[PDB]
């Protein structure tokens, strides 16, 4: 097995209030949208 040096990629963590939406690729319309403020909140 041949080993070569790596690269340590950067960490992208969504561990804070974030926004998001879901789009249908054809119509490019917003199926869903929302904001996650606290995933534990019910």
């Amino acid at each position: 097995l041949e080993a070569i040096p790596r690269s340590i990629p950067p960490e992208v963590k969504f561990n804070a209030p974030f926004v998001f939406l879901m789009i249908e690729q054809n119509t490019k319309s917003p199926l869903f949208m929302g904001k996650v403020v606290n995933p534990t909140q019910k």
Partner: protein
């Protein structure tokens, strides 16, 4: 042709819900839109324009004749998934047994909105409730159970609508990698949450306009998820700065190696859209001045309320979401 109108409607409505609460937010723009766009068919005068306009439509420019014509194609299209993707939307019209509809109205909703019609007896509020809740439960494959819990006894007609979505990540997460991590709610409030992890190539990029990081996860099929991660103290900004086109740009993009941490979610939103929609101009239809002549010439009518419920599930396999309007 109306995608931009919706896109912006979603944002309009969103900014309202974001202002009203801090709580997790989740709703289905398409769902709320087609439900009201459909109602307008049997609405007249201001109550009519008021609706259409609140959905971010400029009556002068794009004629209603073409607005409805558009919802027709948008619906027909959202219903032909890329096989690997499950996406469905149904519109049902429940009429009280003793009701004299207005032919045109039934032909329209059924034609422009692919609507179904049924004849329940609202006198038996338990059975009528059972029929509707069942329709929605079936359509949303169990995701949205008892949508209707309190139904008026004098209810003349209910205009139900549902949307179902189930897709798989085009590049899923391994369950063995998911660990419990910290999630920062406040600058002094942290909660433990099962964090999904995956190292690889992502469509992540940092849009400067929104001062946030934009991540794009494709779904096997014809759907894509967009996650906006705001830079320290810029969430309020991100929210206000969102526009259709900005979302159109990101999609034209590239790729990059990164180690992603995305929490798995199980959240649901329930809304009484009367307060919020009024804020967008839609008030007539909810008042004792609402004109629903288009539905029935019988007695005058009005909306007693507008309930919306959406439910989201995001795991390593992909995403499942349902939305229902009642």
């Amino acid at each position: 042709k109306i995608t931009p109108n919706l896109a912006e409607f979603a944002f309009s409505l969103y900014r309202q819900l974001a202002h009203q609460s801090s709580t997790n937010i989740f709703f289905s723009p398409v769902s709320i839109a087609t439900a009201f766009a459909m109602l307008s068919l049997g609405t007249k005068a201001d109550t009519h324009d008021e609706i259409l306009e609140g959905l971010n439509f400029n009556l002068t420019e794009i004629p209603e004749a073409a607005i409805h014509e558009g919802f027709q194609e948008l619906l027909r299209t959202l219903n032909q998934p890329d096989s690997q993707l499950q996406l469905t939307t149904g519109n049902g019209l429940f009429l009280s047994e003793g009701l004299k509809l207005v032919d045109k109205f039934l032909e329209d909703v059924k034609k422009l909105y692919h609507s179904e019609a049924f004849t329940v007896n609202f006198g038996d509020t338990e059975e009528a409730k059972k029929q509707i809740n069942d329709y929605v439960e079936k359509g949303t494959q169990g995701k949205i159970v008892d949508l209707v819990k309190e139904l008026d006894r004098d209810t003349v007609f209910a205009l139900v609508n549902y949307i179902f979505f189930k897709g798989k990540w085009e590049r899923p997460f391994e369950v063995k990698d998911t660990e419990e991590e910290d999630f920062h709610v406040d600058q002094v409030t942290t909660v433990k949450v099962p964090m999904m992890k995956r190292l690889g190539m992502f469509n992540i990029q940092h849009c400067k306009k929104l001062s946030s990081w934009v991540l794009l996860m494709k779904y096997l099929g014809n759907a894509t998820a967009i996650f906006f991660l705001p830079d320290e103290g810029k969430l309020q900004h991100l929210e206000n700065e969102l526009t259709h086109d900005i979302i159109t740009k990101f999609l034209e993009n590239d790729r990059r190696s990164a180690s992603l941490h995305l929490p798995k979610l199980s959240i649901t939103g329930t809304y009484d859209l009367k307060s919020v929609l009024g804020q967008l101009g839609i008030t007539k239809v909810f008042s004792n001045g609402a004109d629903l002549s288009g539905v029935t010439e019988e007695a005058p009518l009005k909306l007693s309320k507008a309930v919306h419920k959406a439910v989201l599930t995001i795991d390593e396999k992909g995403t499942e979401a349902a939305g229902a309007m009642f």
